Amino acid sequence: NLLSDKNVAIIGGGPVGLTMAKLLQQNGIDVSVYERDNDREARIFGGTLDLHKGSGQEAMKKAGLLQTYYDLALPMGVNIADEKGNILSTKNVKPENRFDNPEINRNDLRAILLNSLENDTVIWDRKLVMLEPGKKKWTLTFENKPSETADLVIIANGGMSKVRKFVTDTEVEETGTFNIQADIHHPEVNCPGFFQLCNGNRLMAAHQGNLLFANPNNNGALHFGISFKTPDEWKNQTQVDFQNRNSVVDFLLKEFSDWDERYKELIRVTSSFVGLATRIFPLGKSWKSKRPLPITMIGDAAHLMPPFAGQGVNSGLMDALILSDNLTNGKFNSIEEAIENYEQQMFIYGKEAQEESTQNEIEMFKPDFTF
Ligand SMILES: Cc1cc2c(cc1C)N(C[C@H](O)[C@H](O)[C@H](O)COP(=O)(O)OP(=O)(O)OC[C@H]1O[C@@H](n3cnc4c(N)ncnc43)[C@H](O)[C@@H]1O)c1[nH]c(=O)[nH]c(=O)c1N2
Ligand SMILES: CN1CCN(CCCN2c3ccccc3Sc3ccc(Cl)cc32)CC1
């Protein structure tokens, strides 16, 4: 085998890195995941994830976890509303499509993947800060923790990874849109009007360059996001301190001044907001060839892209499926060639996904956009 008497280090225990670990481990591969989170009870902020047939779901199938995912996921319909709260479109999930892409909470998905791994596969409180290639092994340097070695390093630590340079000099870029997100607990009580507007479905609305997305039931909480072109005054992210809810409430109430009070109530009752600039890690020219030791990247570390049209985790789970199969099917003469074959495929569907996400972004933020 390519990996017999060798070990693999996966950097990052996100959904992509944990899936990569499971697919390698179940073929007898010595693999560890180093995750910066202090422990597994760390809450993951964000909306739900939906896994697609042919990609995310195919990775779960290969891992024996497809039913586990279905049992914790929820098919959800979609309502499009206007800024006055009129429901313009209602699409519920037809029973024959209930397996197409049901939504799963991110902590639930992490728990599924962790539970499927052998004990002590993930090493918590391990923030990788530097890599160094040796004669045959990488040396991994962690923050204030002892070093580790690995024959193969797989960078899976998300879109802002700083440990990419052995693979590419490409830099993450801001696309020019900005996202504010929040959770409301017990929304049926705390934002009843907007909760009733959703009516069990996800909701999307667009008006004059401001977009609102909401999921009224991410394991009982309501998750929502407000997205817009990054204001020109923010060449230093000025005016809005996201540590100060009053500053954020004031900014959003002005942007949403002509929206229905059900939306304004949502802004008014939120206890804290998270701001996030939209970024892309653009796939263009090939990555570096003839690297000193085998190394590659998967998931957002490889092809972070805007999330507004549903691109994201599924292309990362496709990475893990392809790369793990190449490392274990015994068709390749070296780890480098298995990696090369993975990267060549990923550049094709990754570039397509990026082009679509970037085009979609352009369209959804034109001042007169409607869904
Ligand atoms: C607002 C918004 C909304 C959406 C989405 C994004 C955003 C910003 N996405 C995108 C999607 O969530 C994204 O593709 C995945 O989280 C990618 O998972 P990864 O495992 O690659 O990275 P992810 O960022 O999830 O995981 C990286 C892991 O590495 C760890 N880490 C970081 N640095 C480290 C270090 N130095 N050492 C060790 N560990 C380190 C982190 O703690 C984390 O656990 C999405 N996608 C989708 O498919 N459907 C959707 O609906 C959405 N919606
Ligand atoms: C099925 N999938 C579900 C959702 N995909 C869109 C993800 C958009 N995204 C979001 C975008 C920008 C800022 C914040 C957010 S937060 C959010 C919250 C709720 C919902 Cl439904 C969607 C989002 C697409 C397809």
Instruction: Identify which of 16, 111, 28 has the alpha carbon closest to the alpha carbon of residue 8.
Output: 28
Looking at the CA of residue 159, tell me the nearest atom of ligand 1. Answer: 24
CA distance 81 to 89: 7
Task: Look at residue 44 and give its three-state secondary structure.
Answer: coil
Q: Is residue 83 part of a domain?
A: no
Q: Containing domain of residue 26, as a range?
A: 7-75+100-172+281-364
Kindly state whether residues 267 and 195 are assigned to the same domain: yes
The resolution in Å comes to 2.2
What is the distance between the alpha carbons of residues 84 and 89, in angstroms, rounded to a whole number? 14
Concatenate the DSSP letters of all residues of 85-151 into one string: --EEEEEPPPGGGTTSS-EE-HHHHHHHHHHTSPTT-EESS--EEEEEE-SSSEEEEETTEEEEEES
Place of tokens 């049209």: 309
> What value does the CA radius of gyration of the chain take, rounded to a whole number of Å?
21
339, 290 Cβ separation under 8 angstroms: no
CATH number at residue 227: 3.30.9.30
Method used experimentally? X-ray
140 and 286 part of one domain: yes
End position of a domain, from candidates 261, 279, 297: 279
The answer on 234 and 214 residing in a single domain is yes
60 CA distance to ligand 1 centroid (A)?
17
Q: Report the residue count for the chain.
A: 371
Distance CA 41, CA 210 (A): 34
Report helix, strand or coil for 109: helix
Distance 312 CA to ligand 1 centre (A): 8
* Nearest-angstrom CA–CA distance, 68 and 60: 9
Alpha-carbon 4 to chain mean position: 32
* Local structure of 89: helix, strand or coil: strand
Q: Is 168 found in the same domain as 233?
A: no
**Nearest ligand for residue 76 CA:** 2
Residue 43 known to bind ligand: yes
> How distant is the alpha carbon of residue 340 from its chain centre?
24
Tokens of 26: 């179940």
Q: Which residues pair with 85 in a beta bridge?
A: none
Whether 177 contacts 280, CB under 8 Å = no
Listed residues 279, 307, 325: the one ending a domain? 279
State how far the Cα of 222 lies from the Cα of 184, in Å rounded to an integer: 5
CA distance linking residue 220 with residue 185, whole number of Å: 7
Q: Within this chain, do residues 116 and 186 fall inside the same structural domain, yes or no?
A: no
Domain CATH code at residue 19: 3.50.50.60
Q: Residue 348 Cα, ligand 2 centroid: separation in angstroms? A: 24
The answer to whether residue 186 is domain-embedded is yes
The verdict on residue 82 lying in a domain is no
Q: Are residue 289 and residue 144 in the same domain, yes or no?
A: yes
Residue 55 in any domain: the answer is yes
* Residue 296 DSSP SS3: strand
Give yes or no for a contact between 69 and 109, defined as CB atoms under 8 angstroms apart: yes
Answer yes or no: do 199 and 221 share one domain. yes
Same domain, 251 and 159: no
Domain end marker among 279, 305, 328? 279
Residues 68 and 14 in one domain: yes
What are residue 218's DSSP bridge partners? 221
**Is 309 within a domain?**
yes
Q: What is d(CA 317, CA 311) in angstroms, rounded to the nearest whole number? A: 12
Rounded to whole angstroms, the Cα distance separating 318 from 21 reads 13
Ligand nearest to the CA of 160: 1
Cα–Cα distance list, 137 to 134, 151, 370 (Å): 5, 5, 53
What is the Å distance from ligand 2's center to 307 Cα?
Answer: 7
Residues 69 and 205 in one domain: no
Name the closest ligand to CA 226.
2
Indicate the number of domains in the chain: 2
Distance CA 314, CA 119 (A): 26
CB 163 within 8 A of CB 143: no
Sheet containing 221-229: order of strands: 87-91, 78-81, 202-207, 210-218, 221-229, 173-184, 274-280
300 in a known ligand binding site: yes
User: 92 lies in a domain?
Assistant: no
Residues touching ligand 2 (Cβ under 6 Å) are 47, 50, 101, 179, 181, 202, 213-215, 223-225, 227, 307-308, 310
Q: Find the residues whose C-beta lies inside 6 A of ligand 1.
A: 11-17, 34-37, 47, 49-50, 126-128, 156-158, 179, 181, 225, 276, 299-301, 307, 310, 312-314, 316
